Enzyme design. Structure first.
Site, PDB file in Angstrom:
ATOM      1  N   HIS A  86      16.064 -24.223   9.182  1.00 52.60           N
ATOM      2  CA  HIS A  86      15.184 -23.933  10.465  1.00 52.60           C
ATOM      3  C   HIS A  86      14.361 -22.550   9.863  1.00 52.60           C
ATOM      4  CE1 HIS A  86      16.918 -26.800  12.960  1.00 52.60           C
ATOM      5  NE2 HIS A  86      18.170 -26.264  12.647  1.00 52.60           N
ATOM      6  N   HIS A 113      15.774 -12.726  10.615  1.00 53.37           N
ATOM      7  CA  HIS A 113      15.482 -13.986   9.978  1.00 53.37           C
ATOM      8  C   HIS A 113      13.773 -14.012  10.457  1.00 53.37           C
ATOM      9  CE1 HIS A 113      16.137 -15.037  14.111  1.00 53.37           C
ATOM     10  NE2 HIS A 113      14.911 -15.492  14.017  1.00 53.37           N
ATOM     11  N   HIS A 161       9.931 -16.197  11.173  1.00 51.80           N
ATOM     12  CA  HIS A 161       9.193 -17.383  11.922  1.00 51.80           C
ATOM     13  C   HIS A 161       7.875 -17.302  11.208  1.00 51.80           C
ATOM     14  CE1 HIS A 161      12.012 -18.407  14.950  1.00 51.80           C
ATOM     15  NE2 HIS A 161      12.368 -16.987  15.001  1.00 51.80           N
ATOM     16  N   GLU A 176       5.515 -15.727  16.675  1.00 45.25           N
ATOM     17  CA  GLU A 176       5.880 -16.311  17.997  1.00 45.25           C
ATOM     18  C   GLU A 176       5.214 -15.636  19.056  1.00 45.25           C
ATOM     19  OE1 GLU A 176      10.512 -16.914  17.636  1.00 45.25           O
ATOM     20  OE2 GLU A 176       9.646 -19.210  17.085  1.00 45.25           O
ATOM     21  N   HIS A 180      12.803 -10.992  13.007  1.00 46.72           N
ATOM     22  CA  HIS A 180      13.541 -11.105  14.241  1.00 46.72           C
ATOM     23  C   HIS A 180      14.840 -10.140  13.647  1.00 46.72           C
ATOM     24  CE1 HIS A 180      11.668 -14.263  16.978  1.00 46.72           C
ATOM     25  NE2 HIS A 180      10.625 -13.116  16.573  1.00 46.72           N
ATOM     26  N   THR A 199      14.545 -18.212  20.673  1.00 46.14           N
ATOM     27  CA  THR A 199      13.312 -18.899  20.587  1.00 46.14           C
ATOM     28  C   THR A 199      13.607 -20.325  19.775  1.00 46.14           C
ATOM     29  OG1 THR A 199      12.502 -18.028  18.429  1.00 46.14           O
ATOM     30  CG2 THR A 199      11.796 -16.823  20.290  1.00 46.14           C
ATOM     31  N   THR A 200      14.810 -20.539  19.651  1.00 48.55           N
ATOM     32  CA  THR A 200      15.426 -21.851  19.004  1.00 48.55           C
ATOM     33  C   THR A 200      16.413 -22.241  19.777  1.00 48.55           C
ATOM     34  OG1 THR A 200      16.828 -20.735  17.594  1.00 48.55           O
ATOM     35  CG2 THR A 200      14.636 -21.145  16.698  1.00 48.55           C
TER      36      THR A 200
HETATM   37  C1  LIG Z   1      15.560 -14.448  18.423  1.00 42.82           C
HETATM   38  O1  LIG Z   1      14.925 -15.727  18.470  1.00 42.82           O
HETATM   39  N1  LIG Z   1      14.948 -16.205  17.124  1.00 42.82           N
HETATM   40  S1  LIG Z   1      16.058 -17.354  17.060  1.00 42.82           S
HETATM   41  O2  LIG Z   1      15.665 -18.380  15.843  1.00 42.82           O
HETATM   42  O3  LIG Z   1      16.055 -18.247  18.260  1.00 42.82           O
HETATM   43  C2  LIG Z   1      17.757 -16.783  16.781  1.00 42.82           C
HETATM   44  C3  LIG Z   1      18.371 -16.175  17.789  1.00 42.82           C
HETATM   45  C4  LIG Z   1      19.852 -15.571  17.550  1.00 42.82           C
HETATM   46  C5  LIG Z   1      20.509 -16.010  16.360  1.00 42.82           C
HETATM   47  C6  LIG Z   1      19.842 -16.838  15.193  1.00 42.82           C
HETATM   48  C7  LIG Z   1      18.518 -17.331  15.430  1.00 42.82           C
HETATM   49 ZN   LIG Z   2      13.897 -15.971  15.681  1.00 41.57          ZN
END
Ligand SMILES: CONS(=O)(=O)c1ccccc1
Ligand SMILES: [Zn+2]
Length: 258
Positions: free
Chosen positions: A62, A92, A94, A104, A117, A196-197
């Protein structure tokens, strides 16, 4: 039929396996700068990454995660809207298939080329697992990326991506300093949200920085060479792994500045 960002398993499909996708505090959201209100009760934000110790970088199908050793009190985020101390566990990004999209969160509907993030968990809960079962379990520092001058501190991440091209691949990634990914100003907007995932858990206090960092076209182009697929599978470039803005609903976005 594993979740993803495609036409048949993307953001519009997530609610079926993850009902919270239509919840009351989902992220990301559009940040209407004129509606955001300066909050005098916000304490100074504290980002202390001096002792941060990275361990590995991983392509999870992802995005790619730069993981940190969070077994000790190092790399801490506190202050601002936060009560207590939050420990960095990983970061990570996006990003989009084109410079015109990828972030995002949006600012007055403006989409940036990408968004960083940095994920932190509330130390009063023991670890990440227990923290994601709490309404104030996480704090994510979001940073926008725009295309222009290169970001020197990001190059080491860019250069290792060729070794984790496909889903499941990981590579040792020690001594990486996340301080090299921060813009000059810590001015920010904050609001209660979610991951967000999937599983889209609503445990995040979002702290989104106003000042974006600049990265070169060459750097983001290398992000786009990654694969969503695993080794030996048809190539599907890892691009547009972002979720669109969600309903703000019963929420107010606060600004740390005037
Ligand atoms: C913060 O939103 N980014 S996320 O891809 O949803 C995520 C959250 C927590 C751990 C790993 C990925
Ligand atoms: Zn994220």
């Amino acid at each position: 039929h594993h979740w993803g960002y495609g036409k048949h398993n993307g953001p519009e499909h997530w609610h079926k396996d993850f009902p919270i996708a239509k919840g009351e505090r989902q992220s990301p959201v559009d940040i209407d700068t004129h509606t955001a209100k300066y909050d005098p009760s916000l304490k100074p934000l504290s980002v202390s990454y001096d002792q941060a110790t990275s361990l590995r970088i991983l392509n999870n199908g992802h995005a790619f995660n730069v993981e940190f050793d969070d077994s000790q009190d190092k790399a801490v985020l506190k202050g601002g809207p936060l009560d207590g101390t939050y420990r960095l566990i990983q970061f990570h990004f996006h990003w989009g298939s084109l410079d015109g999209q990828g972030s995002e969160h949006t600012v007055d509907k403006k989409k940036y080329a990408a968004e960083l993030h940095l994920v932190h968990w509330n130390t009063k809960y023991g670890d990440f697992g227990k923290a994601v079962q709490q309404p104030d379990g996480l704090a994510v520092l979001g940073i926008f990326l725009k295309v222009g001058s290169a970001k020197p501190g990001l190059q080491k991440v860019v250069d290792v991506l060729d070794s984790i091209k496909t889903k499941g691949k990981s590579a040792d990634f020690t001594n990486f300093d996340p301080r090299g990914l921060l813009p000059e100003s810590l001015d920010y907007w904050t609001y209660p949200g979610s991951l967000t995932t999937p599983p889209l858990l609503e445990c995040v206090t979002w702290i989104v920085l106003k000042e974006p960092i600049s990265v070169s076209s060459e750097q983001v182009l290398k992000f786009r060479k990654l694969n969503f697929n695993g080794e030996g599978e048809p190539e599907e470039l890892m691009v547009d792994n972002w979720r669109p803005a969600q309903p703000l609903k019963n929420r107010q976005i606060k600004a740390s500045f005037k």
